[PDB]
Design a protein around this ligand. Sequence first.
Ligand SMILES: COc1cccc2c1C(=O)c1c(O)c3c(c(O)c1C2=O)C[C@@](O)(C(=O)CO)C[C@@H]3O[C@H]1C[C@H](N)[C@H](O)[C@H](C)O1
Ligand SMILES: COc1cccc2c1C(=O)c1c(O)c3c(c(O)c1C2=O)C[C@@](O)(C(=O)CO)C[C@@H]3O[C@H]1C[C@H](N)[C@H](O)[C@H](C)O1
Ligand SMILES: CCCCCCCCCCCCO[C@@H]1O[C@H](CO)[C@@H](O[C@H]2O[C@H](CO)[C@@H](O)[C@H](O)[C@H]2O)[C@H](O)[C@H]1O
Lengths: 96, 96, 144, 96, 156, 152, 96, 96, 96, 48
Amino acid sequence: STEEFGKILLKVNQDGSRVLLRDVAKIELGGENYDIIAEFNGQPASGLGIKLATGANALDTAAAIRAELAKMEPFFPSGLKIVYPYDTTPFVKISI
Amino acid sequence: NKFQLTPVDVITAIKAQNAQVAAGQLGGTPPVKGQQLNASIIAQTRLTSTEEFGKILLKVNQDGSRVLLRDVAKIELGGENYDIIAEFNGQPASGL
Amino acid sequence: PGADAKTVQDTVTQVIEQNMNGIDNLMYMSSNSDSTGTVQITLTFESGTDADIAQVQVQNKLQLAMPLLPQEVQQQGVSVEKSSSSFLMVVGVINTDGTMTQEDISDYVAANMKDAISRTSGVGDVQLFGSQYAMRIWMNPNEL
Amino acid sequence: PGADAKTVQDTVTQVIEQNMNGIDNLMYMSSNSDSTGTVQITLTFESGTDADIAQVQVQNKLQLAMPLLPQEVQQQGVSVEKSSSSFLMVVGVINT
Amino acid sequence: GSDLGKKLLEAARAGRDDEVRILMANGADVNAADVVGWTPLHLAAYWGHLEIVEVLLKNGADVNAYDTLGSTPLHLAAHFGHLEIVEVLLKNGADVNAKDDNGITPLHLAANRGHLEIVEVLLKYGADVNAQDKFGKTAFDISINNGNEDLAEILQ
Amino acid sequence: GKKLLEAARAGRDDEVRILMANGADVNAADVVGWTPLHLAAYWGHLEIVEVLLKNGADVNAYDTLGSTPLHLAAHFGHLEIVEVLLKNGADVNAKDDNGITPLHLAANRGHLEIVEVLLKYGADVNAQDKFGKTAFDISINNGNEDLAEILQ
Amino acid sequence: EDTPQFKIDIDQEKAQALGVSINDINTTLGAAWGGSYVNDFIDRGRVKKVYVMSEAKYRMLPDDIGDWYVRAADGQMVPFSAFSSSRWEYGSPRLE
Amino acid sequence: LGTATGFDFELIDQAGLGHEKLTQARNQLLAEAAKHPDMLTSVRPNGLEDTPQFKIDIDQEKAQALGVSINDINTTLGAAWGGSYVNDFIDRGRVK
Amino acid sequence: LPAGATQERTQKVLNEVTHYYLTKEKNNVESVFAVNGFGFAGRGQNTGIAFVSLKDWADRPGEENKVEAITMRATRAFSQIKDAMVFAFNLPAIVE
Amino acid sequence: RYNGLPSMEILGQAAPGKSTGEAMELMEQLASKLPTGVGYDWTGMSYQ
Ligand SMILES: COc1cccc2c1C(=O)c1c(O)c3c(c(O)c1C2=O)C[C@@](O)(C(=O)CO)C[C@@H]3O[C@H]1C[C@H](N)[C@H](O)[C@H](C)O1
Ligand SMILES: COc1cccc2c1C(=O)c1c(O)c3c(c(O)c1C2=O)C[C@@](O)(C(=O)CO)C[C@@H]3O[C@H]1C[C@H](N)[C@H](O)[C@H](C)O1
Ligand SMILES: CCCCCCCCCCCCO[C@@H]1O[C@H](CO)[C@@H](O[C@H]2O[C@H](CO)[C@@H](O)[C@H](O)[C@H]2O)[C@H](O)[C@H]1O
C-alpha cells in the first residue's frame, strides 16, 4: 500500500526525529508509464490490441479470445463493460 | 607504480568515463499540463577515439598536477586478440 | 527506461544485431531505436519458414547477447514474438457508470484480463492501451 | 532455500506465470508454491502438440524471465522438463 | 493434549459450533493447548468465531491464557479487528493491559491496524494509553508513524 | 515566423526570401530560444546566414542557455560563417551560462583555422569557463600540440 | 526528423575534487528525470512494479537541473550546477 | 486417468479476494457439498490447511540507531536458519 | 506529430479526428477507438492512432459510403490540420 | 494457482448410480452461490 511505502524510514535525524519516505516524496499508485491514453467514442477507455501469431487461424483465435473474455465478465467491477471497436474477423465470416 | 595506481584504478576510470547514460527527458510524461518543451537529456556518451581514451582522468595530484590514462599506458586500436595471422601467397591478408 | 535513441542503439540494438547470424531462411532484418527508450528488431523469413523454428533460432542468438545488455534493459524483460504486424482486433473496455477513470480501467485490464488473453493459443502479441499500476514514488528535490 | 510459500509465490511463481505468454497450444497452467522453498508450475498442452516444441517454447519464455527472479533463485536454476509419471524401474542402493 | 482436546482445538478454529457444543457436553479440555501455546479460545479469537468464544468462556476457559510468546486471546481479537469478541473477552475479565514478551499490548495492536472502535473499547476498559513496548513506543507513536490522523486524535 | 525557423534550418534559400520579403520576424525564436540565425549557423547554411544578417538579424541573439550563433558556427567548424558573423559584429568573447566562449568550443574540437580568426578578432585567450579552464588548458588536456603552440 | 536535445557534460575533474561519485551523479540524474524501476511490490495479491522518479513539476525546465543535489563523501550536499555544463544540440528521436 | 466417477475442480480468486477469503469460500462450498451425499462423495481439498508460523519484525529504527544494516540482519537470519548456497567446489573431480 | 510535440497537442489533433468521425460521418461510422501515445510502432508523445468501425454494409449503400470514399474524404479534411501528418486509409488485401 | 490466479483444487466423485456429469452439474450449482468474486473451473479428467 501507499501508506506502507510512506513510512519507509530514510534516516533518523541527530535530534532523533525521523525522516520517512512520505516526507521527501508523494506516494501513489500510478501507471508504469503515462504515454498511452485511449478513448472510445470520446469517453475514457482502455483495451487490448491483439495480433495473430504467425500462421494461426484468425477466426478460431477470435473465438478463443471471446470465450476467454466471457470467463472474465461475471467478475467485473460495477459498470465495467467490454466493447468491440475494431475486429477484422466478422468480414471474413460474413464474406464467406 | 610511479603514480601509485593499478589496473583496478584504470578499469574503474574507464567504466566511469567511457559510459553511455540513460538520463531521461525534460517535459516527459506525465508532464505538468501546459508543458511546451519535450526533449531528451543527453549525458555521457561512449568514447570514439584513442585521444578520448588518452585523456581519461585517473586522478589529480595534491599540487593540481593531472594524471591521464596516456601517462600510464599506450592507447591504440588493435585486435581483440592477436592469435591468428593469415597470409595469401606470402602476402599479408585476412579472410573468412 | 529514460534512454535516448542513440543510447538505445549503441547499448542494445547493435549488441543484439551483431549476434544475429546463422539463422535459416532470413530474408532481411530491420530495427528502430527510439528516444522512448524502446528498440524493435524485426527479422523477416522466407515464405514457408516454420515460425516456431525461426523463433527458436533467433532466441538462441538473443541469449548470447542478453548478458551484454544493460541490467535495466534485462529487468524490463526483453521479448521475442512471432506475429503479424497488423491488429487482428482491438478489445475495448469502458465503464458505463463512470466510476473508474482511464487509469483505473487500464490497471484493471492489465491486472485481470491481459495475461489470460496473452496466453491464448494463436495470440501472437498483445498491446495494452494504457498501463498497469505501479507504486509511484514522486521525489521532491527540495525535501531531499 | 529457506523460503516460505508466500515468498516463493510472490517473488518466483507470479513472475514466471506472468511470462508464460505467446506459447502455442496451451490448454491450462497450474502451480504450487510451498514452504519447503519449492515451486512447480505445470503447463498442459492440447493432445497432438509436439512435446519438444511445447517444452522449448516454455523454456525460452522462462529464459527471458530469469532476470526478474531473485538472485538466489537464478543461482539455484529453474528446471523445465517434460512431465511423466511412469518409470521403467526403480533401482535402490543400500548399505547393509 | 487429549483425544477431545485435539478435536476441540480443531473445532474452535474451524468455527464448528455444533461440534464445540457436543465437546463441551463431553468434557473436552477447554485448556488444551497446541505447540505454540494456543488454547481453543486463542483459536476462536484469532479466527473470529464469536459464539465459540462465548461458549468457551461459559465452560471455564482461561480468558487470560498466554502463548509461548506471551500473547493472549485479547491480543489476537484486538489485532484482527474482532470488535464483539474483544467486548466479550473484556466483559469476562480479559486483562486489557496484558503485555506479550515484546511488551506489546492489545492497544498497540489495534492501533497498528487502525481498528478505531476496538481502540475506544479498550480505552473504555482502562487500557493504559502510555504503555510502551520493548522499543519505547506507545499506541500514539504508532498512529503518527502510520499517519492515521483520526486514531491519533482519539489518543490525544 | 515559424515558417522562417524551418526554412532557415532546411537551408531553403529562396523560401527565406519569400518570408524575408513578407516581413516574417527575422529574430523569431523557438522553444530553446534558437533564432533562424542559430539554425543556419548550426547546419552550415552560409548563404542563409548572410541573407539573415542583411535583413538585420540580431547577431548576438542568445538561446535559453546563453549560446550565440557564433558559439555554434565555431563549435561545428563552419569557418566562413564564423568569419561573416564576426564581420557583422558577433561578440567574439560571448560567454554562455557555463562561461564557455566560441574559442573554448573551437579549441575543444580542434578547429585551427577558426581559432585563428577568433584570435584575429580579439578573442581573450585567458577567458576562463566556470571550471577555470582556458582554450590552452583544453588544447593541452586534448594533447593537441599544433593548437597548443598557437595559444602559446 | 532530428530535434533539440539537452546536452549535459559531467566534469570529471570537478566531481573528483568535490568527492562526488560518478555513479551517484548518474543515478540521481537518471532516476529523477528518467525514472527507475526499483523492485516489485504486491498490489491486491498481484506482483507489480515500484518506480522512483521526480515529481513532474521538478523535471519540466532546464533550470530545474540545478535544483538536484548529490551527497559528497565528506557529507556535503552539492548541486548539479557545481559539476556540469549544458548546451542545446540536435539529435534523432528514432534511429533506423 | 484418475477415477471414473472422479472429478477435479478448481475454485478461483477472480477479484483479488486473497487467501483467507478463498479459504472461507472453499469451506462454504465443502459444507454444501456434504449436504448432498446422494450425488457427491468425498468432496475434499487436494491441498494443505494453514498452520502456525513465526512472524518476526525487524525494527528499522532500532537497527539504524544501533548502526546495524538490514542486509547483515537478513542474511544472518536466512543463512543460519534457512541455509545459503554460497558457491561451488570440486570433490574428487566433480563440481559440487 | 513531429518529435518534440507534446502529448497534449497530440490529444488536440486526436480530438479533431474523433470529432470529424462523430459528426461528419454520423451515417457511416459506428465507433472510434482513439489512442494517444501509440502509433504504428511504437510509443511516443507525438503519435497516435484511431481505429474506426463502420455501420453495416446494408446501411452504407453507394460508392460514396464505402471505405474508399470515406477514407479519401477524411484524409482530405484532415489535410487542414497544422503540424501533423494525419492519414485515413484502408488496410490492403494482403500484408506484404 | 490455476491459470495465473489464486486457486484451490477440490477433488470428489459422483455417488453410486450417479454420472460424473450429474455430480459436476451440482458442483457448478453449488459454486454459483458462493461469495462475490469467486469463480471456478474444471481441470484434468473433468476438463476433458
Ligand atoms: C504503398 O505504401 C505506401 C505508399 C505511400 C505512403 C506510405 C506507404 C506505407 O506502406 C506506409 C507505412 O506502411 C507506414 C507508415 C507510413 O507513413 C506509410 C506511408 O506514408 C507510418 C509508419 O511508418 C509509422 O510511423 C508508425 O508509427 C507505420 C507504417 O509502417 C509499416 C510498413 C512500414 N514500411 C514499416 O517498415 C513497417 C512494416 O510498418
Ligand atoms: C502493414 O501495413 C501498414 C502497417 C502499419 C501502418 C500502415 C500500413 C500501411 O500499409 C499504410 C499505407 O499503405 C498508407 C498510409 C499509411 O499511413 C499506412 C500505415 O500507417 C498513408 C498514406 O495515405 C500516406 O502516408 C501518403 O503519404 C499512404 C498509404 O495508403 C495506402 C492505402 C490507401 N487506401 C491507398 O491505396 C493509398 C494509395 O495507399
Ligand atoms: C433463396 C436463398 C436465399 C439464401 C439462402 C442461404 C442459406 C444458408 C446461408 C449461409 C450463410 C447466410 O448468410 C447470409 O448473408 C448474411 C450473413 O452474414 C446474412 O445477413 C446479412 O445481411 C446484410 C446484407 O444482406 C449484411 O450486411 C449482414 O452483414 C449480414 O448479416 C444473411 O441474412 C444471410 O442470408
